[PDB]
Amino acid sequence: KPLLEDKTYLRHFWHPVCTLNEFERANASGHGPMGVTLLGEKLVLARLNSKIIAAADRCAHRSAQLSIGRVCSNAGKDYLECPYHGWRYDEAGACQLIPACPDKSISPRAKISSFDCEVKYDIVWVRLDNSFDCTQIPYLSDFDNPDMQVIVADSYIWETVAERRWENFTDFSHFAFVHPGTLYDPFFASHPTVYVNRVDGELQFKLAPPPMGDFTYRCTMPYSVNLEIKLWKDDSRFVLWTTASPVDNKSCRNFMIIVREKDNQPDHMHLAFQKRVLDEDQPVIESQWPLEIQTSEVSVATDKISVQFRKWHKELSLSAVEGREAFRDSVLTNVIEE
Amino acid sequence: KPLLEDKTYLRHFWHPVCTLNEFERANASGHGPMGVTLLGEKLVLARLNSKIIAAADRCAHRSAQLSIGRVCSNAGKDYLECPYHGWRYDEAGACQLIPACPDKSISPRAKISSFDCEVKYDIVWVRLDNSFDCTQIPYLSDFDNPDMQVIVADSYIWETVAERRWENFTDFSHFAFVHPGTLYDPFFASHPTVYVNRVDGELQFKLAPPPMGDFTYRCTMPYSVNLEIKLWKDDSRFVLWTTASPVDNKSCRNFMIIVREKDNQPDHMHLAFQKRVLDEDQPVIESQWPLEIQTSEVSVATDKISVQFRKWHKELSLSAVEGREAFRDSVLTNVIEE
Amino acid sequence: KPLLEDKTYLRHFWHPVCTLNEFERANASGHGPMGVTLLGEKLVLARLNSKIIAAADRCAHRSAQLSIGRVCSNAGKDYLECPYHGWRYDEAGACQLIPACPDKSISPRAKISSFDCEVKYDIVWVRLDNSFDCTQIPYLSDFDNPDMQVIVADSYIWETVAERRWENFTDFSHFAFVHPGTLYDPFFASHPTVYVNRVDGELQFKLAPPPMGDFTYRCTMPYSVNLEIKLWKDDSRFVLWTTASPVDNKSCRNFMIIVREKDNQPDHMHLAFQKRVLDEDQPVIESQWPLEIQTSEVSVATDKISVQFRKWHKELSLSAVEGREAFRDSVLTNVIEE
Amino acid sequence: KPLLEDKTYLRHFWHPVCTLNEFERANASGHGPMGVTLLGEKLVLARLNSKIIAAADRCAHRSAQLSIGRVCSNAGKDYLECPYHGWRYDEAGACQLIPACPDKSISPRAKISSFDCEVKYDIVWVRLDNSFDCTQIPYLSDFDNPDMQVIVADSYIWETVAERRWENFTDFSHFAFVHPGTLYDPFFASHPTVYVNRVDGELQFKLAPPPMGDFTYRCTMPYSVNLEIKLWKDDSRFVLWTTASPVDNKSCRNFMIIVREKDNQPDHMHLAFQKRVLDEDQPVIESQWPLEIQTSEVSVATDKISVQFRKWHKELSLSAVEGREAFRDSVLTNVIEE
Amino acid sequence: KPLLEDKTYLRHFWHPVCTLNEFERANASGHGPMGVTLLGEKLVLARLNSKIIAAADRCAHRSAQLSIGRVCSNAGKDYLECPYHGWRYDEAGACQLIPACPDKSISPRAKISSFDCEVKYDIVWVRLDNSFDCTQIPYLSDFDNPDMQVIVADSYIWETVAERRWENFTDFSHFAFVHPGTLYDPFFASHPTVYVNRVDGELQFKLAPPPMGDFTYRCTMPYSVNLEIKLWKDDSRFVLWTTASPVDNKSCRNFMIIVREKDNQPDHMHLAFQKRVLDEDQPVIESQWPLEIQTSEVSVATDKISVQFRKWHKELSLSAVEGREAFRDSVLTNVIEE
Amino acid sequence: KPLLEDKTYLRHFWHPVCTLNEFERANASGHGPMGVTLLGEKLVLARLNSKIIAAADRCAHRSAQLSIGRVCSNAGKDYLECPYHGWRYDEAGACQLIPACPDKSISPRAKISSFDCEVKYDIVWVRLDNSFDCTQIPYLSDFDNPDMQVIVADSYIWETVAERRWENFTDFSHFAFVHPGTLYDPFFASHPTVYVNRVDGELQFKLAPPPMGDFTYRCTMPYSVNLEIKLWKDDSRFVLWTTASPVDNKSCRNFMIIVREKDNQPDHMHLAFQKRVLDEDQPVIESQWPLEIQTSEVSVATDKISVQFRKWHKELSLSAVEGREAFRDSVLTNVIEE
Numbered sequence A, B, C, D, E, F: 001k002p003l004l005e006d007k008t009y010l011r012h013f014w015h016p017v018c019t020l021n022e023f024e025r026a027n028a029s030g031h032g033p034m035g036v037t038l039l040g041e042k043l044v045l046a047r048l049n050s051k052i053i054a055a056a057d058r059c060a061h062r063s064a065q066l067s068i069g070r071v072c073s074n075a076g077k078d079y080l081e082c083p084y085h086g087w088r089y090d091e092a093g094a095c096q097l098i099p100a101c102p103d104k105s106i107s108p109r110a111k112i113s114s115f116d117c118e119v120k121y122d123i124v125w126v127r128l129d130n131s132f133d134c135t136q137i138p139y140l141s142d143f144d145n146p147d148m149q150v151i152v153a154d155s156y157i158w159e160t161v162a163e164r165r166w167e168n169f170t171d172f173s174h175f176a177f178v179h180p181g182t183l184y185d186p187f188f189a190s191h192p193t194v195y196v197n198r199v200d201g202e203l204q205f206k207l208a209p210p211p212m213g214d215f216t217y218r219c220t221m222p223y224s225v226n227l228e229i230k231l232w233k234d235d236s237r238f239v240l241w242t243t244a245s246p247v248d249n250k251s252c253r254n255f256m257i258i259v260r261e262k263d264n265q266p267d268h269m270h271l272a273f274q275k276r277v278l279d280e281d282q283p284v285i286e287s288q289w290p291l292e293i294q295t296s297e298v299s300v301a302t303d304k305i306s307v308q309f310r311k312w313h314k315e316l317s318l319s320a321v322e323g324r325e326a327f328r329d330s331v332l333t334n335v336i337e338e
Ligand code: FES
Pocket: A059, A060, A061, A062, A063, A064, A082, A083, A084, A085, A086, A087
């Protein structure tokens, strides 16, 4: 009974797999190799010649995990060396040395899948499928704004799927029950008028109450949220950002970024407050079952954001099965409520 | 190769899900909500307006577990409140308040399955399916006999199916091997004459040896045993009762009740002795594999009780698939050996 | 995508299930019963009348595990007694006493499968299927050579399949990467000429470098290796032997034997060195995925041994499905490279 | 720097060592033997001929712990049997059988200290020293009041000394900081007029605010509190009682009893609420150091109860060192504030 | 048999108690309060009005730990609030509010010891005793050098005393045995000429071999090391700094800082390499017993640094017992070898 | 209140510190070094030039534990190398190389205590003090008897002192209570006539009942027992031997040897039976308190062996304090009962 039966669409989006700090801590070299799991796939990350690559975590020779091998160099070029019989892979996933027969000549069969991989906002992003060429790395505002300061949090795992995490983050009606002593609900028992737009691959909506502020959401699909809070009294802004990464069928790894105006307060005060909130949501959201969004779930008027999110996920899931042009239309066609 | 392929029949019987004490200890309120699993189904128990209800542990809105919510009251009526967005359910499983849009009007889709649920012998019983209206809560003797005193034991889990637990409880031929230093076998190497009757939904049989006593069994199907021990010298009686609850495909939760004549002895002496016996049976019974009763198992003459138990289970399993009248006939038709 | 889809062939070979010491330590009696798992089957070992038998670990009466029962004797004959209702089994798996009705007469249905089982080199070997009568217990050299001394190591589990363990043991090209500070590679970047023969159920090959020695392999199929190391300077020999037992679809239990010329050195020095090597291989080999050999794996010239191993495994797997004569031909037909 | 340097006085009071239920659960017999520690002394409890005795947990023969032996009977008399060589002790601590030389005659040296021991309010009380004959078992009200119902809680350990636990229980000024979301402070920033009397071995005081109620304390020395709460609106009463047992120099074992008017509410609701309060106090009180009351601690006006408690403890500590008449005067002399 | 019997001298030096990051992570507020132990004393750290204070972790009222209370504010001034009855302390350790009697007037007895406390190099330093006014916060070079970048490592505990940690850090003769595969020894079997000076409270010495570099040590007493490594080929410098904090009689908490020229390498590569070295030293140094430096230890010529360190520690230990002028002379008198 | 206040005497006896197998397993080399504790002293064992030495586990340079260093060789001579700065010790405890200044000349201060150490019965024995030259390695019979076979068990720790272990091993009156279902008592309620002799450093006594056998004890002081069991029917003998090693003030390490006539039974059957007995004694003996033998313990007639054991221990303890001749007289003077 799940809404989103086919997951092929998710392969065409950029997903975060770890923070840059997490990547550099994964191996004593500071350059990997490191193992991550994305959409059920086991990937290896390694920094070769100052660029982080993402490849299949599976040597073509005898299937050892490259993520427990080592980054090594020859003639000023870096390679990912297998831990087992030492085959070396370059940034494109081509095996450039078989040490057992080094003269050579290396079969084209000796090659692993190499994937789109870029560092942005001090997070490592991977896109498994290039074919449809219409997705970009999720939007975050003010990372480079010199009036503000950034916290890139360590990532955290929830035992639910990424859709449940996104719908939790964009919902206010649960504050009275999940967050009663922690978060004030500025809309309780209200039905604010909220227009939901699709603009350039993003869900965009704005919430205003009837200290008070506005809530402006830019949400790169399928799993990101950029929440701009603008205070009414004064023009001070606060950005809370999260993206859920679809690790596998039962978990997601979540990346939080806090952007705030410079203040001489300890960063840990802001991180610990968000952790306190996260720890209130976590057991409620992990109790939701089945994990996958189900068609039988009952939506009411205040679930407009969630309904629009589910609608676009379903359409994207179907469009990707249809082919390149269907998908690109679904991603790129703007839809302004009116 | 299992004897009892279809489990639909089990839904029509009353099964114990927890003791009353267990239910009251599950939540600081003393009124739940509490989670239990019955026949693979996740249920929530809560005490609303002095009655314990059993419902599906799954909110209709976004599938959160109601069993981690709270019992709350409005205008003197109790409700089961979801932990996530606060929908309130009444004793019938109808949602009576959506706090996001409270004026209202609540869709009929906003409703969870509510099940038969009654407290008897300080145990909580649930029946998942009403349709065939021919089963009752298992028989226990002397709970209200003012000459005797009762112990309702905490329940315990065995990693086997409920049929294996029942056949273990009604068998004497294993005493010499499982219980040699603990229980005397009054029938060893004997073949006592035992008549097995079906009477009003119960297996009934009596065992007599050739301090000594008689063993009178009334066994409400599918998983209860009421064992009356009447001593020969004197007319003193002792009741040992158990029911196995079919939690899921690999475990059962077992409920023991001891009824004895008042004696000024500590209850713990009787409980600890039964635990000692249980701990001798447990690893032998949990070693039985496959867990499910298999058709290839070899029965001999002394397995008459077990064979009659398996026969009636198989007939009940088939009758329930056939329909209401077939099932009611199988449950209700008495069969006296002769 | 696995190379070896059908596993029926493995049933026709002798596999080690435990060392003799392991068997004697499994039960306070020193005679079992003991539980082992072979090819996914649960077996019971017990020593009855001075011979270790192997049978199905499943009583025919009510399916209790015989491996938690006891070896008992009646009239000078030993029996395997079930822990539950005491049925006694003889060395052939026939039930010889039902204590509930002992006079008697025991049904032929009351019988468990009994398997080939022999102790050799202080290891317990089992063969599940007799039908094709063409396999023998793997070859080990010098167990009885009075100039040498033997270590039969405790067995160890790796979380991989037995083929991966065998290919690891017969490969030198991984030394530079897995064993750099522990084992010298006598062939690095060389392509020694290696002839691989099939002789009397064994893969046989010899490796010579261009202290130095020769490496002479006799490898009883499907999973044994007898490695004779003969030093060039002097004629001193050292035997390293291993057999991988196919426990189940995700693990193998490995048996090592070291045979060396008598030396007044502590055996633990030799065992600990081999453990150090094993601990270097273990995480690399356990990283290989999928566990099962896959057809897509890329073999190069230096994998000749592994390729010949995979070839004969595939042929054996197909021959066994074809029937007795096909299998016997595959096992017994010698093939000398030329 | 501790206030109460000498602890001899504590030996002359009755202290609770376990609940009756705890005693009956300690051994499968329901009659002990059981081990407890009181004032650093290791004691054995056993029920012999329907009376629980307390003795030194140390056999006179070779110093084995009697608390791991067994209660046994001979000629209708119960004995405490040593686990080692079987010496039997009667209720007075006299050895009545040496099984190695049973004819006999038992030395008077073969004898263990036996102590005052009585069950009251379903709690086991022990008094180590009889000599001064002026102390009684602490006061609890309404245990036998048929309009009310009693909960005797399982005991709990805090890692502090018993004086700290008592002063915590009789203090309201910590509610705003330790219990802000749990307990309302009816006296915050007030200085109610409180008269503290010494009456018949008890500290007695009453607190009234300026639902509301009165707080009437009768506090048997050295470590008990009986708190009667009488509501203003209506005459309904609620009794909260606790006694701290001085286990050793770093811990106390605490006994709580709740007495309330009959109400058809689950007992667990009242127990769980008190546990919630206890869990707020526990880490704050366990942080107090040094554990022992120190002379340098700074008392203010609102510590009147604590100051009077410390005064009488110090006087009792000195009186006991002085002798029988000094102690009896300190215990028994009433002192009414005026 | 210990060299340094009297520890009073250590109270007069600045010791690091935690990194700034560690302090800010200790409490969700980012401002403490936090608990640390220095020279056996329990201290509380809290940030009040933008300055971190250090005080005795013991409320004057009833001895609760202030480190589990909270930083609170009144009328724009911050206070350290006790968790128990809410007494508030200012930066000088004076109690400024007793909430039970707030009008007021607070006794001078209501006061806790307040200690010297300053943040330098992103580390929190405490000096317990001011009296002799001749010590300063240890020397570290290049923290503010804009051509270089700094790593302030998390602190780590070793189960040894701080003298053993210092002597380990300033010694090269152990490299061949503790660090054979990790650190090259530039002086092995050499006796370089090393002059050891006392200059302004520092041990100063320089080591030169006969890539290569010079080793210039400035070592603020009693437990700091600033190691400047200047490469011969090129003038590039690398600073490795450590200070051992005397936590108690059996452990020290160690603070490492790495200063290096900017390089676009990941900081984790440098941290992980130092951890690898630390993990080689740790079990050897923790094996040294007795922990305290003993007079019987045998020094050879290559222990010149250690001998001079022990000499000055012994003299400082004696001078502090003698009085202010003796100590100030020992700390401040320069001694140039010649 | 302990009987044996002074422990100096124990230093003059040979004590077992580990089995030979235990020593060879302690380090991958098979030659140590290994750490043991004897009479509170930390010792290092290492095999140098085919002989195991015992020395103080404390390097003279900077007090590192030699037991975590390594056995190394130079010019065909073995040395114990310190893990810290590499000082090498020979079999006499003299430092023969300081690698920092190797030319040399090594101070006589650079030397560790070296102790008597010999392997006998595949056990490592150490004697800390030579001075009185009158003790030998405990007696065990039949180790070299070619009609019998030996089991040298792994050693085991009990949390009691060695005297309690010895008295437990030589006592039959506890069988009925500690071993009721495991060991038959051949003397229950009997007072067999037992003569206790002191012969050549041994307690010697023989016990005969009124399958049956004689029990002949030769007990080398202070802690060994050689029990010869000779069956009446037939002349078959069975030797059970144990020695308790005084590890420290709260524990002993116990060495068991079983010698039996050759029988084709598994050794594990005999070991497991003795472990079953040991596990019955262990919690009773560990309950004995105070651990040290106390003067107040009450001995009866059947404790004759224990009383004679305590007498000779007390005399030995006093004699050793008196001097060489007193001790030698106490050890060597035979005393035949008559
Ligand atoms: S598995 Fe990677 S080189 Fe062989």
